[PDB]
Amino acid sequence: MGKLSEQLKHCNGILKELLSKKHAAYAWPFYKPVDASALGLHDYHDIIKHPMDLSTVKRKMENRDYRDAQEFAADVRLMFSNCYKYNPPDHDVVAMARKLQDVFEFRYAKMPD
Ligand SMILES: CNC(=O)c1cc(C(=O)N[C@H]2C[C@@H]2C)cc([C@@H](O)c2ccccc2)n1
């Protein structure tokens, strides 16, 4: 019932939206951990020290791992940051990251106080 639980419900709402059909055209690369081997990205885990994806964020939310909205936001932004760090800015995945991050940031900003 407290503020932290309430803010985490808003976070859970955002997470459900990021995983929803509405955003699937650009969200799908972020659904599961990057399979570096399958994608031929044999330097991925040398460059990205802390992989993150929405299935991992969902597991952590379901497990009550996140103690506050800030911790949840840090993982969602880590996921985007990894994309911007690894990929050349002209790869389609970077455009898709930017579009999904726009959805995230605008709704995260509507956090209940
Ligand atoms: C989070 N996902 C990724 O960072 C990623 C990277 C690459 C990739 O090959 N990156 C090489 C350009 C770099 C050296 C490919 C994919 C793949 O899921 C994908 C294909 C086509 C449109 C969108 C996504 N995802």
From Swiss-Prot:
What changing residue 87 to A does, per the record, is: Abolished binding to histone H4 acetylated at 'Lys-12' (H4K12ac)
UniProt domain Bromo: residue ranges: 2-111
Q: Name the source's superkingdom.
A: Eukaryota
Segments spanning the bilayer are: none
Q: Where in the cell is it found?
A: Nucleus; Chromosome
Q: What is the effect of changing residue 39 to A?
A: Reduced binding to histone H4 acetylated at 'Lys-12' (H4K12ac)
Q: Domain text from the record?
A: The first bromo domain specifically recognizes histone H4 acetylated at 'Lys-12' (H4K12ac). It also specifically binds histone H4 acetyl-methylated at 'Lys-5' and 'Lys-12' (H4K5acme and H4K12acme, respectively). The second bromo domain recognizes and binds histone H4 acetylated at 'Lys-5' and 'Lys-12' (H4K5ac and H4K12ac, respectively).
Q: Which family does it belong to?
A: Belongs to the BET family.
The free-text function statement in the UniProt record for this protein reads: Chromatin reader protein that specifically recognizes and binds histone H4 acetylated at 'Lys-5' and 'Lys-12' (H4K5ac and H4K12ac, respectively), thereby controlling gene expression and remodeling chromatin structures. Recruits transcription factors and coactivators to target gene sites, and activates RNA polymerase II machinery for transcriptional elongation.
Extra remark: Some specific inhibitors of BRD2 that prevent binding to acetylated histone are promising therapeutic molecules for the treatment of cancers or inflammatory diseases. ABBV-744, a small molecule, has been tested on tumors with success: ABBV-744 antiproliferative activity is mainly restricted to cell lines of acute myeloid leukaemia and prostate cancer and is able to displace BRD4 from chromatin. GSK046 (iBET-BD2), which specifically inhibits the second bromo domain, is a promising therapeutic small molecule for the treatment of inflammatory and autoimmune diseases.
* Subunit architecture: Homodimer. Interacts with E2F1. Interacts with (acetylated) STAT3; promoting STAT3 recruitment to chromatin. Interacts with CTCF; promoting BRD2 recruitment to chromatin.
> What is the name of this protein?
Bromodomain-containing protein 2
Q: Which organism is it from?
A: Homo sapiens
Q: Please give the first and last residues shown and the length of the full protein.
A: 344 to 455 of 801
